[PDB]
Symmetry: C3
Subunit: 157 residues, 3 copies
Amino acid sequence: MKILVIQGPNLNMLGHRDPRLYGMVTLDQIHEIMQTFVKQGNLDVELEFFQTNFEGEIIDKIQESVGSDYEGIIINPGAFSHTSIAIADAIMLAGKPVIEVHLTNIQAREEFRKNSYTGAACGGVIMGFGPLGYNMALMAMVNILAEMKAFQEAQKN
Amino acid sequence: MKILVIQGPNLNMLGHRDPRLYGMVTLDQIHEIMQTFVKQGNLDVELEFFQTNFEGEIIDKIQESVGSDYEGIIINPGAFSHTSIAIADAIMLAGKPVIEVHLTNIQAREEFRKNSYTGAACGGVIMGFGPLGYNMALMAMVNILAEMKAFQEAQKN
Amino acid sequence: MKILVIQGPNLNMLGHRDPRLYGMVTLDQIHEIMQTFVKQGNLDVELEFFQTNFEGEIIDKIQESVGSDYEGIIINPGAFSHTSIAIADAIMLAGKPVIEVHLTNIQAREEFRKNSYTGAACGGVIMGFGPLGYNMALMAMVNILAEMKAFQEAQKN
Ligand SMILES: COc1ccc(C[C@@H]2C(=O)[C@@H](O)[C@H](O)C[C@]2(O)C(=O)O)cc1
Ligand SMILES: COc1ccc(C[C@@H]2C(=O)[C@@H](O)[C@H](O)C[C@]2(O)C(=O)O)cc1
Ligand SMILES: COc1ccc(C[C@@H]2C(=O)[C@@H](O)[C@H](O)C[C@]2(O)C(=O)O)cc1
């Protein structure tokens, strides 16, 4: 399975600013960690990574996964989680599993971060585990996809 | 008259997901339905179509219309209707009639879709007729333009 | 010191619409006025100007200044002030002083203009002086930077 990993605004600045809620691990490092979770679990999973500060590039990227070779999306829309009805609408039209990840616990910060329009549109949401949350999402995605295919095996029969 | 039609985010995915509020017709077909309306009524109207998932491309495009061939704009800002103060400000400086269209009835859906910052800046708003809404906007644009022209022609006399 | 000046959406349209709150001076004219203020003060300041209608372009530009030789930013996020948590987050990681400027007094307009997420992340905010507000920001920026430097080399010894 090809799994698309989408990283929203300012996530490329990880490990260069703000080790209060963020630590000192970089975005590339998290992606390396995801890669070795796949490698070593021996999962038939090809990860593709995409980071952007543009809401429209996120929407473009989600729309291009439709009818593509991608079976699922792992997304951290960053600040756009709280504001982007348009990303939420793209998610609802994706026709495939989408898991939202947050590094931080968005229930425990400013009032303006508590709402997630994107999260409400995703099947599941993970927050507050830092980098590990992405490994959690990979484990879930693999199980969701296995379960979906095995359901559609015994489906026709 | 050159009339510019702007379609916002996810509108390019019509007929490719969600047959309930949206049906099964595509964006390209709606645009062919519009041309057909210009013909069957012999309107002296040249249409240019533009879809984007980018808030800034929408703003650039409205701005580009200022002191241009374009006599008016028919716009469906999509989800950005409810959030984009910047698109509303661009509409306010366009110096020409702008009409907002929605496919769905935005008074009858989620609470976060009820506000249209963009619609409030437009001269008039149309919602809940599906594809047909765009032809209704066409008919109004022609009438508004004719009345501006006549008023101006009888302003010098 | 190189100083970065970022101008948000619709600001390029100054003088080309709406002398009610906005007057008749253009964006290019404002930037010459700032240049003049530097020249006349014999300030050792190199200004770089950037305007965009794109939220992600503003965020890329703020990030690009991290680690560079730009020592400060003067920003008018325009309508994104009221909406963009993502731009506020970028300001928070900038690692350098950032001053927000508005031409108009945003406490005295529509209720939706009152909140500035970006202004709250900035060290200081200036509003309602028209173009003059940008020379006020320049004066402050120079004084803040000289203060910061007079402190670094004195804490060293
Ligand atoms: C140093 O750059 C950052 C800035 C913010 C975050 C947190 C993410 C955001 O961008 C926030 O706007 C959002 O509220 C939560 C966030 O999505 C997360 O916890 O992963 C991560 C790295
Ligand atoms: C198939 O993809 C979509 C998703 C949403 C819409 C509706 C338009 C939007 O994008 C919404 O976010 C908005 O609230 C209403 C909408 O403007 C419309 O009814 O045309 C259309 C097609
Ligand atoms: C001629 O075009 C404009 C439109 C609005 C402004 C005001 C600026 C904005 O873009 C607003 O959305 C914001 O609320 C205040 C503003 O930032 C300002 O006073 O500079 C300036 C020029």
